[PDB]
Design a protein around this nucleic acid. Structure first.
Ligand SMILES: CC(C)C[C@H](N)C(=O)O
Ligand SMILES: [Hg+2]
Ligand SMILES: [Zn+2]
Ligand SMILES: [Zn+2]
Length: 876
RNA sequence: GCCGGGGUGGCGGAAGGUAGACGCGCAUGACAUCAUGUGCGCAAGCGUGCGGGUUCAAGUCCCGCCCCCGGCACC
């Protein structure tokens, strides 16, 4: 008997699936239904390795299942060549981006293919191309003319590693997104934004119906950040200006004893009294320079200045000082607060600190507040010390006092959003050139549609396009030295670019019609596939791409080009692939693991000594090693950086794809994190041969056998198996639909076992062949190649055409169950009787069990409880 | 602190009514591989975060805490 040879089959069939273009995406889905399966596309920057390959595989299993079910299936792939991710890397290995990007691609495709992944490569999309980014601009313009693209001054964030700015959603922990070490500083810059706050309520209210993981939803609810409230207006002393302040407790207005403008408020220095102007000017250059790391290092300690102005209280109608504490933020609300310190601890502690008087206005129910009050009273109650309101309920207070202002024109009700507009000007060569020129007569004038695309200049000095501080395009005037399209005057093109996240906010829509040279896509095409039914990807994009994209799909829908409104109907988040990683040498002594200082640094503890048990409980082993010493290993995250990634290309050659796939599929649930391992890769190697051999041992014994038989005339063991099969199908099929591929497969192996146990007493019968025909189609999604090899030993056509095996519900009907006997809960033993076999029978068959355990303690009995399914309990 | 999601064999995990499917590791029997056994306890008996409890039957239901992971935390 021959053996399973990956290298014999796996690459042969690949060549075939492409030639016979199965996953060729249809243009305009007709009858049988549609399914759009999508893996988030890769920034090309590194060679791929299992760690990456998890997600891509998912989508592919999924996609063969749909296509096996006869759905019309779009499973596309492309790249994310533009913006920081690539360039960053290119530069880090001094390579010109085009050469690097069109190279990292080639390698990527070759991995994906190797594994057995299939796409419709006639839809490939290289964002960095002009072919594409032309539209990224087309969008920008359509966005400008609808008021939603603009420039504006303000505090941008600065990444010195990247030598550019980033949007707020790229500042995680308080640090650059792709550099989880380099903190970001603030800088004053007129820059381009996209007005995303014009969609805040929609972005929030449309989440409700969206079937996403509660975790991405929950993050997007809080980040967008609704707050109902009211904009009150404080006149400044004598000055014709007035000061707006967001409050969620306008029922305190009388308790206002001062105001606090956020450090970089225009009105901070503009009102600064010329005595205190010196101290106030120092506190800004202090604030600005201090970063989001150090703000939390300081702790929640209050710190400020008195400006030397005043402000009238709308309500009481008297003066009060105005301060500039940094505990009010400027990128939210007004950048200014009415500060009641008697009902809000933050302000209390500012009042408790800088002697700023503290006024009570909301007296507590039954038991009253003390005087002096020694902390805040944030909970609500009855209004006091507030003139005509004296007696009112704090809850009703809000809407009344709001209403009271709405008359006198002193204020209004409003709903600010935490969402801050999406900055996209990047000071980098690599990235879409913003399609706007700067005029001298006519302001800042757009570019005509038909003039597009605004191509990047070509720049072949690698050590030129390195980003120095200002835009790398500035150094090249010829680019910007152009005319206007409004009159014809002197004209500097904008030297800035679009962030990579831009292109990654509709690529899903581009895939539907990826050669259209007139639009970003013919809508008839978009609507024919969208929404995406399955977006297979990860949490790290919860408030970035998965926010940006939607706003884009909304605004594209608000030009009426896409009918839907949420682009992904089905987000499925996935787990990181972990590997066992060598951490370094260790000095063992009896039962005391001493840690040298590079191996402790790498572990990230402070300790040097450890018990062997201390190693265990942090989930690590100590192994031998090449160098002679003992070495400590612990699962760590599979990255290039960690130097622990299982490489796809090499790995395929010295093992296989299907084994790759079974390994990354059958370990953990998909949404869990998993650990790729020798122990598991072998598991695969076993499971895949028990498939092979069992169909090899029966190759002759099948050919001369027909897979036709009268369903209800199978008796005995042919009757059992056929049941088990169909029970199995139901589980393989229900667990494909759920995306539960771990257990899905387990359930496939269980039958294989049972198929070995079938053949032990029972030769190749029709049932068994049909048991195989089925098994192999049930295998095609995961182990497609070994699944195709065995099929074609018998059948003339591909598994893709074979159709998803149809379920026979009446095989699931259980007859002669195994039913557990218990007496007072303790499961004494099990008996075998038909489902409906009534109470009177079970009694009989129990009374004389394996160890007559039912009698052992059943010498009384009072009530008795049968239940047809699987239980019979005797009481006492 | 708030939100989000988890505490079940030696491991990843499976699931009101036989807890521990399937695999890994371990252990013996075959000519690495297949077969066979494997919650724990020598046993009495015990076991799904910890305590009560409701139920003939609780991983599953109720009341009261605990703890780990992820994110947001002067908004
Ligand atoms: C969907 C995309 C924003 C994904 C991104 N290109 C990445 O590689 O993570
Ligand atoms: Hg390109
Ligand atoms: Zn950076
Ligand atoms: Zn002009």
């Amino acid at each position: 008997m021959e053996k399973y040879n990956p290298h014999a089959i796996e690459a042969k069939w690949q060549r075939f699936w492409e030639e016979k273009g199965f996953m060729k995406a249809k243009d305009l889905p007709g009858g049988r239904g549609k399914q759009y399966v999508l893996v988030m596309f890769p920034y090309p920057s590194g060679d791929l390795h299992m760690g990456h390959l998890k997600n891509y595989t998912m989508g592919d299993v999924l996609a063969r299942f749909r296509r096996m079910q006869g759905y019309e299936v779009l499973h596309p792939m492309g790249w994310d060549a533009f913006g920081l991710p690539a360039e960053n890397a290119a530069l880090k290995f001094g390579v010109h981006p085009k050469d690097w990007t069109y190279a990292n691609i080639r390698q990527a495709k070759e991995s994906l293919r190797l594994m057995g992944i299939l796409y419709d490569w006639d839809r490939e999309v290289t964002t960095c191309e002009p072919e594409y980014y032309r539209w990224n601009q087309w969008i920008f313009l359509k966005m400008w003319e609808k008021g939603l693209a603009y420039r504006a001054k303000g505090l941008v964030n600065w990444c010195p590693k990247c030598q550019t700015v980033l949007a707020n959603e790229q500042v995680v922990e308080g640090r650059c997104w792709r550099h989880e070490d380099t903190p970001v500083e603030k800088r004053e810059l007129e820059q381009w934004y996209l007005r995303i706050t014009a969609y805040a309520e929609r972005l929030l209210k449309d989440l409700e119906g969206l079937n996403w993981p509660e975790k991405v939803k929950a993050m997007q609810r809080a980040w967008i950040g609704r707050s109902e409230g009211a904009e009150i207006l404080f006149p400044v002393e004598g000055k014709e200006v007035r000061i707006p302040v967001f409050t969620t407790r306008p029922d305190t207005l009388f308790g206002a004893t001062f105001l606090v403008l956020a450090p970089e408020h225009p009105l901070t220095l503009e009102l600064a009294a010329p005595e205190k102007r010196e101290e106030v000017l120092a506190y800004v250059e202090a604030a600005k320079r201090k970063t989001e790391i150090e703000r939390q290092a300081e702790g929640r300690e209050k710190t400020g200045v008195f400006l030397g102005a005043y402000a009238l209280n709308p309500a009481t109608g008297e003066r009060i000082p105005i301060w500039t504490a940094d505990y009010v933020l400027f990128g939210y609300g007004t950048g200014a607060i009415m500060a009641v310190p008697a009902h809000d601890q933050r302000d209390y502690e500012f009042a408790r600190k800088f002697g700023l008087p503290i006024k009570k206005v909301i007296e507590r129910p039954g038991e009253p507040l003390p005087e002096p009050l020694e902390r805040a009273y944030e909970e609500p109650g009855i209004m006091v010390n507030s003139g005509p309101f004296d007696g009112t309920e704090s809850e009703e207070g809000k809407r009344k006092v709001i209403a009271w202002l709405e008359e006198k024109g002193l204020g209004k009700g409003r709903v600010t959003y935490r969402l801050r507009d999406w900055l996209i000007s990047r000071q980098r060569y690599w990235g879409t050139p913003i399609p706007m020129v700067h005029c001298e007569a006519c302001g800042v004038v757009p570019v005509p549609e038909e003039e597009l695309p605004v191509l990047l200049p070509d720049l072949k000095d690698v050590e030129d396009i390195r980003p120095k501080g200002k835009s790398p395009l500035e150094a090249h005037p010829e680019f910007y030295e152009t005319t206007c399209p409004k009159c014809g005057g002197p004209a500097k093109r904008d030297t800035d670019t679009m962030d990579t996240f831009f292109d990654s906010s509709w690529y899903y829509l581009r895939y539907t019609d990826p050669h259209n040279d007139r639009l970003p896509f013919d809508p008839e095409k978009a609507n024919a596939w969208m929404p995406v039914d399955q977006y297979i990807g990860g949490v790290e994009h919860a408030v970035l791409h998965l926010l940006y994209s939607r706003f884009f799909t909304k605004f594209l829908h608000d030009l009426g080009m896409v009918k839907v409104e949420e682009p992904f109907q089905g987000l499925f988040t996935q787990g990181m692939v972990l590997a066992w990683t060598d951490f370094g040498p260790v000095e063992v002594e009896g039962s005391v693991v001493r840690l040298p200082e590079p191996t402790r640094i790498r572990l990230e503890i402070p300790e040097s000594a450890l018990s062997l048990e201390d190693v265990r409980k942090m989930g690590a082993e100590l192994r031998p090693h090449e160098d002679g010493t003992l070495h400590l290993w612990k699962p760590a995250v599979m990255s290039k950086s960690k130097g622990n990634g299982v490489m796809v290309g090499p790995f395929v050659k010295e093992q296989g794809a299907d084994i790759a796939r079974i390994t990354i599929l059958f370990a953990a649930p998909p949404e869990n994190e998993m650990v790729w391992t020798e122990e598991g890769v072998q598991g695969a190697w076993r499971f895949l041969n028990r498939i092979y051999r069992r169909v090899a041992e029966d190759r002759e014994a099948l050919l001369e056998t027909s897979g036709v038989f009268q369903a209800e005339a199978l008796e005995g063991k042919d009757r059992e198996l056929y049941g088990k099969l169909h029970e199995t199908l139901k589980k393989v099929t229900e667990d494909l639909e759920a995306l539960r591929f771990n257990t899905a497969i387990a359930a496939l192996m269980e039958f294989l076992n049972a198929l070995y146990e079938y053949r032990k007493d029972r030769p190749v019968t029709p049932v068994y062949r049909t048991a195989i025909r089925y098994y192999l189609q049930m295998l095609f999604p995961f182990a497609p190649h070994l699944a195709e090899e065995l099929w074609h030993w018998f059948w003339p056509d591909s598994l893709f055409e074979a159709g998803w095996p149809e379920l026979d519900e009446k095989a699931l009907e259980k007859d002669v169950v195994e039913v557990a006997v218990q007496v007072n809960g303790r499961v004494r033993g099990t008996i075998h009787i038909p489902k409906d076999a009534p109470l009177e029978v079970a009694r009989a068959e129990a009374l004389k069990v394996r160890n007559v355990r039912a009698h052992l303690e059943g010498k009384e009995v009072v009530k008795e409880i049968y239940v047809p399914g699987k239980i019979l309990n005797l009481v006492v």
